[PDB]
Design a protein around this motif. Sequence first.
Motif, short mmCIF file in Angstrom:
data_model
loop_
_atom_site.label_atom_id
_atom_site.label_comp_id
_atom_site.label_asym_id
_atom_site.label_seq_id
_atom_site.Cartn_x
_atom_site.Cartn_y
_atom_site.Cartn_z
N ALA A 155 0.85 -1.18 0.00
CA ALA A 155 0.00 0.00 0.00
C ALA A 155 0.89 1.24 0.00
O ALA A 155 0.70 2.14 -0.83
CB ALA A 155 -0.92 0.03 1.25
N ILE A 165 -1.58 -1.02 -3.70
CA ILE A 165 -2.97 -1.31 -3.27
C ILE A 165 -3.43 -0.04 -2.59
O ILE A 165 -2.59 0.76 -2.18
CB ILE A 165 -3.23 -2.47 -2.18
CG1 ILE A 165 -2.37 -2.37 -0.96
CG2 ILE A 165 -2.98 -3.81 -2.84
CD1 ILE A 165 -2.91 -3.24 0.18
N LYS A 166 -4.74 0.14 -2.50
CA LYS A 166 -5.37 1.28 -1.83
C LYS A 166 -5.07 1.20 -0.36
O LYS A 166 -4.56 2.17 0.22
CB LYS A 166 -6.91 1.30 -1.97
CG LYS A 166 -7.40 1.73 -3.35
CD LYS A 166 -8.91 1.58 -3.55
CE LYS A 166 -9.76 2.43 -2.61
NZ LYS A 166 -11.17 2.22 -2.90
N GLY A 167 -5.41 0.04 0.22
CA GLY A 167 -5.18 -0.23 1.63
C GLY A 167 -5.82 -1.54 2.04
O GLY A 167 -6.21 -2.37 1.22
N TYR A 168 -5.89 -1.74 3.33
CA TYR A 168 -6.49 -2.93 3.88
C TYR A 168 -7.15 -2.57 5.20
O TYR A 168 -6.92 -1.52 5.80
CB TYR A 168 -5.43 -4.05 4.09
CG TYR A 168 -4.33 -3.83 5.11
CD1 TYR A 168 -3.21 -3.07 4.74
CD2 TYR A 168 -4.43 -4.35 6.42
CE1 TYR A 168 -2.18 -2.81 5.65
CE2 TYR A 168 -3.40 -4.09 7.34
CZ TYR A 168 -2.28 -3.32 6.94
OH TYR A 168 -1.24 -3.05 7.81
N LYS A 214 -6.10 -1.10 -6.04
CA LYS A 214 -5.92 0.14 -6.75
C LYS A 214 -5.73 -0.10 -8.24
O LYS A 214 -4.99 -1.00 -8.71
CB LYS A 214 -4.71 0.85 -6.21
CG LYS A 214 -4.50 2.19 -6.83
CD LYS A 214 -3.55 2.87 -5.89
CE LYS A 214 -3.46 4.36 -6.13
NZ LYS A 214 -2.34 4.88 -5.38
#
Lengths: 136, 136, 136, 136
Positions: free
Chosen positions: B38, B43-46, B62
């Motif tokens: 991230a 990736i956007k997040g978790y 993402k």
Amino acid sequence: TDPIADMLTRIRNATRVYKESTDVPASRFKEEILRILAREGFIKGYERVDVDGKPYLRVYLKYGPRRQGPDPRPEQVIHHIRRISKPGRRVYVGVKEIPRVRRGLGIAILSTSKGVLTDREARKLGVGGELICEVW
Amino acid sequence: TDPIADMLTRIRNATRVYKESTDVPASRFKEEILRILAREGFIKGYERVDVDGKPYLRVYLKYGPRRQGPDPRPEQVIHHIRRISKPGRRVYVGVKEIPRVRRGLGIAILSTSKGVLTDREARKLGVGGELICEVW
Amino acid sequence: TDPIADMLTRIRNATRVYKESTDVPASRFKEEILRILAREGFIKGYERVDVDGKPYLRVYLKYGPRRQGPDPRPEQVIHHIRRISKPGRRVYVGVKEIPRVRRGLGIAILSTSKGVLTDREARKLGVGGELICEVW
Amino acid sequence: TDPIADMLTRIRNATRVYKESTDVPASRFKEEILRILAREGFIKGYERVDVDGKPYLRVYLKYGPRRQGPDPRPEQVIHHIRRISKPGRRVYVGVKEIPRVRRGLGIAILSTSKGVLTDREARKLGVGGELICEVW
């Protein structure tokens, strides 16, 4: 504006990015084209949806089997969906003139006197009409 | 079983069908690799999501800008992700042997004494570790 | 007309359909952008070609490894190739202002006083210039 | 080995990377299935090509119209092709059990007494045979 082309683009574009559904503004005529796409297997089905007062039609997209080796992407069901008749350049055909789309391996939706029918239905009821779209 | 490679394959496969999120069984280590993925933008997040007692990690994928011309698919951010150190085929690199991934236009993610580190972080901390995966 | 955008589109479009090569009309400036794409690994190389008197530059496209499970398609090498500066809306940057493209995981080609350089080269020679394109 | 499924997989895979042609080791039967595939429109054609004594069949693949909006990929004509009767798992259908593939919008190709026939040809000749593959 061509609402019908705009629905068919909204549908084709949602399948290209593997979406579960897509909402197009509701209409009786759009509801009957969806009624045929659903009976013929191109979509799972549709459902009327009012979102803050506005009527929509929510289309539930259908995907075919997993691909033949580790590729996650399902095989598509709507391979080609496209308008023929339209705003400014209309196309009408009579019962004798209904084309067999893609050698019999595709369907064409016609708007006829006896309603929205597939070319196979039209021919059977002995009607012609406006070639709305072809799909396979 | 290999844990880590399940998670990587599940992130790869979610994006190939333009999924908004994918869930991986939670773990301190998995949190570490996602913390790094991230932050380097992949990736956007978790969110740790427990779904039904069992902890899960809800990776929010993402995707970049749509493409040039009516192609509905976004461009991807994760273009390549693969496990290098398998189990039973473990790879450890000591600092000067930390490789440069894709000429310097990709990251490797190490597991080291100094925590979980991207290759430049491991070189800067001068650490060595095991080569988990490469991503660009 | 923007020749340079037209080359980069011709290149991106040939990779999208897995072609071995593509010919763009020859020019010294296009030859130097190809000279950098080739040294940085985005293409295999190029070669001058006269076809019936007209000079062309034949670009030999590069593809990365087979995909991770029976999917025939190679993994691409040029993921994103795009113009920044152009006809009508030009972009110049000075040595201090050269951006790191995609967090260090991408390259930007600049036209500078010391010639066509990558942003990493530009910064080193202490030059700025026109941001021709970004690629990763 | 299964011969036939090599040929089908090699036609499938050539088109997925937009190849102009693909070569399959020649055979009377392979000529038959290609004779049928080309005539129902799924390939351009073939030439028996001997390359280095060994006979080959140079399948010339067919692709349809480019897509709507700057997407350089042609639309495909072979969207699905798979071997049904494997070796050691042979399938034979007697005339009334000849299936309708994909609702009637796909063909099956039979091997029968009356030659190599598409499913409607087998029903019209009233023949039964082994189910080689399905294609739409």
